[PDB]
Subunit: 247 residues, 4 copies
Amino acid sequence: TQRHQGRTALVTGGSRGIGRAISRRLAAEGALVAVHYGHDHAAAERTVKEIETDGGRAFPVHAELGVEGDAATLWAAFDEALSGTSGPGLDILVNNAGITLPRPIAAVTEAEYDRVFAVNTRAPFFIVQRSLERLRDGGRIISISSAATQTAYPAIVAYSMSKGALDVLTPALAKQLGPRGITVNTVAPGFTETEPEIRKALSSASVFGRLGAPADIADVVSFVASDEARWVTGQWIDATGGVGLGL
Amino acid sequence: TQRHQGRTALVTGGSRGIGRAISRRLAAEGALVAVHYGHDHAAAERTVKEIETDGGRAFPVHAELGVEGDAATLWAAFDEALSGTSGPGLDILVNNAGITLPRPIAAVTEAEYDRVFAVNTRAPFFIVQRSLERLRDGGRIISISSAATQTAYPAIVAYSMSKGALDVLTPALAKQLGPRGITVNTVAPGFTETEPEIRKALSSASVFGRLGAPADIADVVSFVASDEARWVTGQWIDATGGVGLGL
Amino acid sequence: TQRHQGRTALVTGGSRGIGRAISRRLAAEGALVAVHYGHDHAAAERTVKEIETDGGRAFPVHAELGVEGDAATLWAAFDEALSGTSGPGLDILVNNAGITLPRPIAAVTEAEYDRVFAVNTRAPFFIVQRSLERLRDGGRIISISSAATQTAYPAIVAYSMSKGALDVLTPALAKQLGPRGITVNTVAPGFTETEPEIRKALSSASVFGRLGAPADIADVVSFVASDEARWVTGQWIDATGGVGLGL
Amino acid sequence: TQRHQGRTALVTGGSRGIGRAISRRLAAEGALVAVHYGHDHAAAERTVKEIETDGGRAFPVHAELGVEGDAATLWAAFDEALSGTSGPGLDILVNNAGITLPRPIAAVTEAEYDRVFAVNTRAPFFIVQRSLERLRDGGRIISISSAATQTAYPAIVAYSMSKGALDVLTPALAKQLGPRGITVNTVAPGFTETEPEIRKALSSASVFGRLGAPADIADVVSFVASDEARWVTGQWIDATGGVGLGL
């Protein structure tokens, strides 16, 4: 396609699963992709080489999220990488970094709560805040949310709340950034097989009666990030295979 | 792109404005496009030749909508065209046919009401009903709605109600047709310049402070109609430039 | 409570089921209730006497809906009743009149479609239009919709579309009528037992695992119609026992 | 009315503004009201005496929110109060405690962010978690949110995100608690005058062209908390005077 020819993308948690497919799709369409990772160096290097093997350009960016100085670290390491190279600006920010918390309310601890909010809400918020100094006109902010923000799923309530908070950011920034031709969208995956009775309920929650694949999400994100989605902003884009549709 | 290589599309009111850009985008990506028209023969022939000049294939399909035997006529004329040719099936249905009624409630007559419901709701409903016998697996139903179904616009209330009714159809069919890998989506345009103080309020209703162009809608529709949007179904896809976002 | 002391209400299809409980609740709180009916004279007389027995005031209003001159007939008969009596104005309009069409798309006929749109959309629209000349400041318009407008229920698709259209009217009029302190709301019932496997799916579609009762709806409508809901307008008020909540 | 005769309510931030009107409305309808406060002892004592003067029963409950051991402290102090008295159970939880952060993204500090999340999300979450052990059948959880969760208001983005997260909790718990006849709802106030160009934009954001009063919210909350709203659950109840309706 070559829809992102000449552009610079950053994908938080870009090293694997959904993060990885996004990084790959964007890099395959000409984007220079900053592949962010917090823990998994080898997976980052894996994703980058994969991209380079296929004839795109990407580079690793190390920042542990949900720790004091996470956002600063991320953007410090992004600049360090581009310096003496493409300028300090970017076109496409994808907030994909996240940790799960599969506990209903009765079992969620302060430690687990604080951890999920630190990584899933606080990190992306300050990453985005510091993004706005660098984000060019016609740019893209894309937050990866969950079906569970808009469909009641008690067993992951604290996780869903973390994504809910980030969903409020999308319309706020689409309004603020609109005059510069920047779109801000949420893409909400459903239940995705990445790398007993649960697997069954989640497959059949789709009207297509399967789990999503990383490629399912990455295909929607690649569109939202293109000039073709320039008239689409402030939206919650359902990438769940029709989760929550009926009953 | 060639995203619709080998597929058959039907675009109701495909002869001009949004209808025309959709027809053109789809035909430019390899779709064989049935260009439907109710009144404007020359505009239909115009759109078809344009497509053929550019090296796609399309053909005219005549059916006056909101008259007894409209849906039958349409599908009679679609088949007549494909017969002894591509088989009777289709991949992509776009409900774009519509008439405006810019009157607030106090001024809407029975004649005008009945006319807008006949064209905007009753016609597309029976066109879709008769579509389901012909619609192949992995197919696409795309209804063109309005921003005014989800954002209060009193001055066009009866028109909005007509589109509202058709918006209920999208989730219903996405559930029913899901098992066959068919997606059903609404694409909602905003205020679009096609071929005094009104023009100003409508431009600035967008967070981008302009009217839409036909291409803005057609770019979103082309995506929804592609294999890239296969994980997107039952949705109301906002193609308004962020109309109704703030306040 | 006596929340509607001194007010005049009209409840379309007020003779039984949900219509009847609404009529009764409003009349029990001091409202003078015009009990509309299209076919069922005895049921109307039944509801009125019931109300009078309990020490409220109500009167019958005959108008066959979905026939040429329905809205005119209704308001002609409302005035005929109040004339030489309370003035021609009203405080509370409840659009409760409706007919079901339990057929999925493949089986809906033109006759059945046209009938459901005539009764469920066209009748209430022109009843409301003609209401606005008579509707006092601090007044109430309340449309009775269905859970199936916002939750995919293919088996009643054409019925849902009819209610969908009327749902677009609520926000339109809440904006137009706002300056006069009039609220316009939709109240959406779920599945309600009025006077095999279906009954089971509908009971368990509620998070409370029962069907609604008429009183469940009438309690919400009585609130929306009171000065207590004066800050609530343009809303789709869910009276379904949490239908469509999870999955 | 006496709708809450025999019931026990807890209103977080119940000492003034919206908190206070809620406390008063509930206590005026027979509820025993635990008036929570974090800083403002005199305001708490003020609200309690007011209630007692009018012939309801209420008591103060001290807990600084957004500090380690806030939820424990609150419930420790609730029990201490009821002990040797009404049992340890409650019927009605109102999450009204909140702090504002009127800064757009460019100006939000970590300190301010962490403070607003601690008070507005983390505190109510763990207050609710610990509530579920005590909450009786037919009970009520009511979260006080903001219009700005569903209408883009960039200038208060971090505050809105905090309320967004709590909005995800409502549908989750309405599903989980449904079988016990407990309703969980959000009530979203707009812009409310409590105890230059801003005041003007906020008044005219309502279709009624005024700011809300505490009583506007408290009237809706009193309904949601009554047996009359028993069929209303998982909902986002708009108490904004039609903020965000048009454009």
